[PDB]
């Protein structure tokens, strides 16, 4: 049998009992990276649970950064939203549609939580621009290299003209405008980025020596972002083209793995809460039917020799779940979020053990530290099949998954 604990206050950030969460201190001990999952995007109970566990990890375990599925320039605008107590400091002016929908309630809660608690937290973007629009990365790169390697400002500029066509506000719309370029131009862009990355890597010893050592670090981060953005656009154009080779979806997660890895050693004092989907936080291959859909970011991260990565998945016992529907014409993001039947709970489901251990009407929290018949877990409206004792450290379960209010 397992270690479980009913947590009644879990869905109430304001009125929280931290003793309910003492179950988590064994695995939060000597961890520097902990992922707060979500069985599906856009779920209100999952934002509530995320805020409560954020407040727990912060106030009892000194976590000082939050990782988001947004590019690092998106994240720096969110940190402007956070610290600004100025007039009309609304989130709609420091976020984009998809960021707003994925993270809105959490971000509003966090802004008001740090203004009411004096604590300060470091927002970090661990993802590509979640719009897959490379313009910001390209423009900031051009501004850095004009100082540290002006001789290849032309190429950068031409690159941004070559990619100016990629202005979507979602992954799918920029994907569609990427499939609209003829392939000679796609290849021109990809090869030009690889050439840039190699010149910069090779000149590093002298480019570090101009202005500040950190401008080269930022230029390399921007180039990494762009390279993986273009390769995600390609991989996705082939997903809706039937040329999608098994496993390609691992690429974006690998980027995020790298981004987390490279940052945590660089600032060895950072304890980072990660807000990312269950499939990204997972530590084993993501498989819905036995195929290898992706190596998740967390599998890479579990290979960190320091063994200080923990993954806490979030799931629910509800009958419905918000689900993304493609396409949704006219919708700002090229998809819509519709209430759809969750995947059925079966005898090999984590959720069926949750029913048979905690009940159906109080949120639950358990360790995976025990052999178990549970092979499966809800993800979006489908399910993943995996060893759940090695895919996640913990499992938070809530009775139901309702659409978070502010997504539209």
Residue numbers in the entry: 10 to 417
Show me the paper's own sentences about this structure:
One of these resistance mechanisms entails the enzymatic cleavage of the macrolides’ macrolactone ring by erythromycin esterases (Eres). EreC is an extremely close homologue of EreA, displaying more than 90% sequence identity. Crystal form I, determined to a resolution of 2.0 Å, has one molecule per asymmetric unit, and crystal form II was resolved to 2.4 Å and has two molecules of EreC per asymmetric unit. Both crystal forms show that the protein can be divided into two parts, a major and a minor lobe. The major lobe makes up the greater portion of the protein and is composed of 8 β-strands (β1–6, β9, and β12) forming a continuous sheet, surrounded by α-helices and loops.
We determined the three-dimensional structure of EreC H289N in two different crystal forms. Most of the EreC structure is effectively identical in the two crystal forms, as is reflected in pairwise RMSD values of 0.25–0.41 Å between the three crystallographically independent EreC molecules. However, there is a notable difference in a loop between residues 295 and 303. In crystal form II, the loop is directed away from the rest of the enzyme, and we have called this the open configuration (EreCOpen). Not unexpectantly, electron density corresponding to erythromycin could not be explicitly identified in either of the two structures. Therefore, the two structures of EreC are henceforth described as apo-structures. We selected a water molecule present in the close vicinity of catalytic residues (H50, E78, and H289) that is conserved in both the open and closed conformations of the enzyme, strongly suggesting it is the second substrate in the hydrolysis reaction. By comparing EreCOpen and EreCClosed, in conjunction with the docking results, we were able to identify a loop rich in glycine and proline, which is capable of closing over the active site. We hypothesize that this flexible loop closes upon substrate binding and returns to the open conformation after reaction completion, to ready the active site for another cycle of catalysis.
